[PDB]
Paper text:
Pf4 and other Pf phages are members of the Inoviridae family which have recently been shown to be pervasive across all prokaryotes. Inoviruses are filamentous and rod-shaped, roughly six nm in diameter, that contain a single-stranded DNA (ssDNA) genome. Pf4 also promotes antibiotic tolerance of P. aeruginosa by self-assembling into higher-order liquid crystalline structures. The CoaB subunits adopt a 77-Å-long, α-helical structure, with the C-termini pointed toward the core of the phage and the N-termini directed toward the outside of the cylindrical filament.
We used real-space helical reconstruction to resolve a 3.2-Å resolution structure of the Pf4 phage. All side-chain densities for the 46-residue mature coat protein B (CoaB) of Pf4 are unambiguously assigned in our map. Pf4 filaments show a rise and rotation per subunit of 3.14 Å and 65.90°, respectively, allowing multiple CoaB molecules to pack tightly around the filament axis in an interdigitated array. The structure shows that Pf4 filaments have a diameter of ∼62 Å and an inner cavity with a diameter of ∼22 Å. Density for the ssDNA genome inside the 22-Å cavity in the core of the Pf4 phage is clearly resolved. Unexpectedly, this density shows that the Pf4 ssDNA genome is linear, rather than circular ssDNA, which was the expected paradigm for members of the Inoviridae family, since it was proposed for the related bacteriophage Pf1 (10) as well as fd. Clear density for the phosphate backbone of the ssDNA genome is resolved, but no density for a second antiparallel phosphate backbone is observed, as would be expected for circular ssDNA. The pitch of the linear ssDNA is 15.7 Å, meaning that there is exactly one CoaB protein for every base of ssDNA in the phage genome. Analysis of the interaction between CoaB protein subunits and the linear ssDNA genome (in the Pf4 structure with ssDNA) shows weak contacts between arginine 44 residues and the phosphate backbone of the DNA. The capsid coat itself is comparatively tightly packed, and is maintained by several hydrophobic interactions between the CoaB subunits, which repeat along the filament, likely providing large net stability to the phage structure.
Residue numbers in the entry:
A (entry chain A), B (entry chain A), C (entry chain A), D (entry chain A), E (entry chain A), F (entry chain A), ...: 1 to 46
Amino acid sequence: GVIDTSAVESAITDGQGDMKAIGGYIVGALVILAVAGLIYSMLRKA
Amino acid sequence: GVIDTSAVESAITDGQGDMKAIGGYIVGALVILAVAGLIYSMLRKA
Amino acid sequence: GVIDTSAVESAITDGQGDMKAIGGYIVGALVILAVAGLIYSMLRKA
Amino acid sequence: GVIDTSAVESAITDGQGDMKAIGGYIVGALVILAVAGLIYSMLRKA
Amino acid sequence: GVIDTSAVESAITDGQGDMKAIGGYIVGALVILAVAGLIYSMLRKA
Amino acid sequence: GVIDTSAVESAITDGQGDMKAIGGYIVGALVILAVAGLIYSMLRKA
Amino acid sequence: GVIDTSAVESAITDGQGDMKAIGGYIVGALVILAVAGLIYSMLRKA
Amino acid sequence: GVIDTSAVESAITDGQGDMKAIGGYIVGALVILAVAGLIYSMLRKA
Amino acid sequence: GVIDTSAVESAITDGQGDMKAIGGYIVGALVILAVAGLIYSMLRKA
Amino acid sequence: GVIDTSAVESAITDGQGDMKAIGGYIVGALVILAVAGLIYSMLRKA
Amino acid sequence: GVIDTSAVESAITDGQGDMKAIGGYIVGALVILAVAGLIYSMLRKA
Amino acid sequence: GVIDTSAVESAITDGQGDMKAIGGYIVGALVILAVAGLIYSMLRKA
């Protein structure tokens, strides 16, 4: 009496493979305010 | 069952390319108070 | 058996075109406290 | 399906025009401790 | 088949006219710690 | 459809009248290290 | 068709009378780091 | 409708009685660099 | 034609007497991060 | 009509007994930068 | 007229035994930003 | 009635092994402004 849920794992494993894609696109934008955070500290201490 | 997230990386890679633009516009204004910080020290020691 | 959702994309693409308008009106007000943040530092160091 | 956001830019452009007003009222009070900072140095060196 | 929403704008335009009243009562209390913030700096530098 | 906010201004105008009281109690303690700062300079120069 | 809300004001006026009690217990602990903040400044200037 | 806050004043009056303990342990270490600051001045003037 | 609701007030007055019991068990755990919040401030200022 | 909440106080009194354990492990690490803060001041004044 | 709920406690006591497992896996990742939070403070004070 | 959480510890132990990697990449950049902080002090004292 089953219902075919084969279209579930095919849909959301491709879903969770897309959460990883837009996680790496944020990490690449948070290191901008990490690098610029501490080369401001070099100019101030000088 | 995917949703097209192709408009994400096209939107925020151009976003993080703009954080770099206004980071270099601050560094050019912090060296003003680095140079003027230590040519004041030459006049005082004289 | 469809329902005409043509009035959806006509309504919210004009919606997301208005989020961009009031995003640029905030950026123009946050640079006021960025510029005035570091010309206070010039007067203090003098 | 828009919502009239015409009352937004009319409200905060007049808002950011007021941040400039109270920025210039602080600069006029930080030059007091810049001028008095270095006419104390004239009396001490004498 | 409308429902009279005339009691809405009469109720919340008088509501948002009261948010402005208690916004100006806070600004009058944040300038106390702005003025006293920098007449402490005059006594310390002396 | 208002809510009585008459207990707000009665509560925080008496609040900001108390920030002024403990601001003047600090100024009376910072002039101790201003006066003693420069009658030490008289004894050293002698 | 009312519901007796007489147990409301009896419960939260005694509630807001207790927020005042633990506000005064914090003020008595923030003046410790205000007094000790500026008798450290007397020892350093000496 | 109260909540027993009797465990508050029993917890932080013993808390603020401990801020006083580690304030007096710092004052005993700042007088070391006050005494040694001005018996260096006796050796230099000799 | 009533239905005996005498088992209601006997069940939920003992219910609301138990909400007070686990409210006082949280207040005893929030004062831990209130006391430790400001004896960290004594060590940093020293 | 009660629900047995005897597993509550047994769970969070052991919870708040663990907040005290990791509070004392931080105090032991903030005195490192208190002691080293003022034996740097002895070397500089010498 | 009962219904066998013996499969309930066998299912959720093993459920709450798994909430404890992934609670300890978070605590092991929050101490990374506690240790690195205050060995940054040693390098800055030096 | 369990749910397989074996993919949890495999995912976040590799997660917390990556927090350590980018902690050591910051420590290597804070010692730059520690070394340069005190070879500036040698040039000034000379």
